[PDB]
Each structure stands twice: as structure tokens, then as C-alpha cells.
Amino acid sequence: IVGGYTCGANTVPYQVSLNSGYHFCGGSLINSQWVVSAAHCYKSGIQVRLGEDNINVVEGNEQFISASKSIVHPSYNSETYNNDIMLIKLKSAASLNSRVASISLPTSCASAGTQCLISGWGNTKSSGTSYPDVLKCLKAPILSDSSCKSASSFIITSNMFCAGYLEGGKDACQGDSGGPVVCSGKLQGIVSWGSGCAQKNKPGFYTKVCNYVSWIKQTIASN
């Protein structure tokens, strides 16, 4: 997260860190057994880390639970990033509390101009790199489809939306992928892709979670 602020320990209690020996992606806890993340974050040997603030220090509220199964969306296209969504089942149920809490799935799609919360342990610089130990947060509005279209050379699908600031300086970045975009108190986005971070006229793109609720509900009903 570039241009954001220190969230504060456990103020975003649905935020997970995905760890394969090191933090590599975020995710969102949607119930005691399931995490939503980006398909492009798929890898084997995922440990899900809940209750995290400083990812390098055991602070006392962590739960570390191994993934038992990962399910990349059936139509995930790595070429275009279309359907950039994945479900991770936990080997054992998380103990839900004030610091480890689930986020609801939306029942409708968020509207243009809505201010959302984006969070993660990604790079905090637009040029070069610096990786935080504590969770960073960014408030950012969903941008109109027409404005997102002209803000990328790539082709955008209706399973994606963009959010952020065309003036630059405020964006998600490398290492935030998979993490939550929360609007109206529900999970509306997944950190998906971008061109650099916090560059002028290059806002972030996000998986439009509202389009996936049926598939998520079906899948967790049977796994």
C-alpha cells in the first residue's frame, strides 16, 4: 500500500496474510474455515496467518492454520486476469474473536464513487521498494467504468473494477494482491492487478466479488 496509513493492530480483523516461508499475498476471512484471495496468488504449501499486525513478530493474537485445499476459480485466465479469485479452505476452523473476524459477502455490487478500505503488507513505495511489518490501510473510491477503461492499455472485463486516485500517490502494490477491498461493510474487491503502483493515471484493478457470490456459496457448501 502506497500513500496509505498504519491501520492499527487488529483493526482489520478479516485481513489474512498468506505465508509460504514469508508473506506473499493477502486474503480475506469469510467464515471460520474459508479465505478468499486472488487466483494469481495460487501456490502449494500455504499457511494462513490470522490475527496479524506485525508479520515479523509474534504479538499474541495470531492464529496460523495450514491450507487443506485451494480452489482457483474454474475460469481463471492468467493471460487476462479475468476471474482472479481463489478459495482456500483451512485445515481446522479458526477461533473467531474481536481480532479474528469474518467479512460478509456482498448482496449487491458497489457503486462508482463509493469509498472503500484496502489493506495489506505490500510495497509502500511507488519507486523502489520498502516492505512494512505492520498492516497498512488506504481509503479509495471506486472509479467509473469509463474512467477505468481509459486508464489502462489492457482490456478490462466486467469481473473487474478499478479504484483509487488518477492523480497518483495512493494505490495498492506488490504484496497486497489477494487482500480485501471493503465497501459498505462487505467484501467487494480482491487486490488483483495494476501498472506499477501509485502512478499518475494508472489506478489499481480489483476482482469484482459481487459476481462470484453464487460460486463461492456453492463451493463452500460442498467442500
Ligand X SMILES: COC(=O)[C@H](Cc1cccc(C(=N)N)c1)NC(=O)CNS(=O)(=O)c1ccc(C)cc1
The catalytic residues are 40, 84, 177
C-alpha cell read off for 12:
482489520
Q: Which of Ca ion, ligand X, none lies near 177, with the C-beta cut-off 5 to 8 A by kind?
A: ligand X
Residue 217's H or E segment, with its range, is helix 213-220
Window contacting ligand X (CB under 6 A); options: 17-25, 95-103, 181-189, 196-204? 196-204
Cβ(40)–Cβ(192) under 8 Å? Answer: yes
Distance (Å, whole) CA 74 – CA 88? 14
Closest to ligand X by CB, 141 or 196:
196
Q: Which amino acid is at 85?
A: I
61: alpha, beta or left? (left if phi > 0; alpha if psi -120 to 50): alpha
| Nearest approach, Cβ of residue 194 and ligand X (Å) | 2
Q: Quote the cell numbers at residue 58.
A: 509474534
- Smallest separation (angstroms) from ligand X to the CB of 38: 8
Whether 34 and 87 have beta carbons less than 8 Å apart is answered as yes
Residue closer to ligand X, measured from CB, 7 or 94: 7
Which of residues 32, 70, 184, 195 is near ligand X by CB under 6 A? 195
**Which residues, numbered 40-79, are part of the site for Ca ion (CB under 5 A)?**
54, 59
* Window contacting ligand X (CB under 6 A); options: 64-72, 96-104, 106-114, 192-200: 192-200
Q: Which residues bind Ca ion (CB under 5 A)?
A: 54, 59
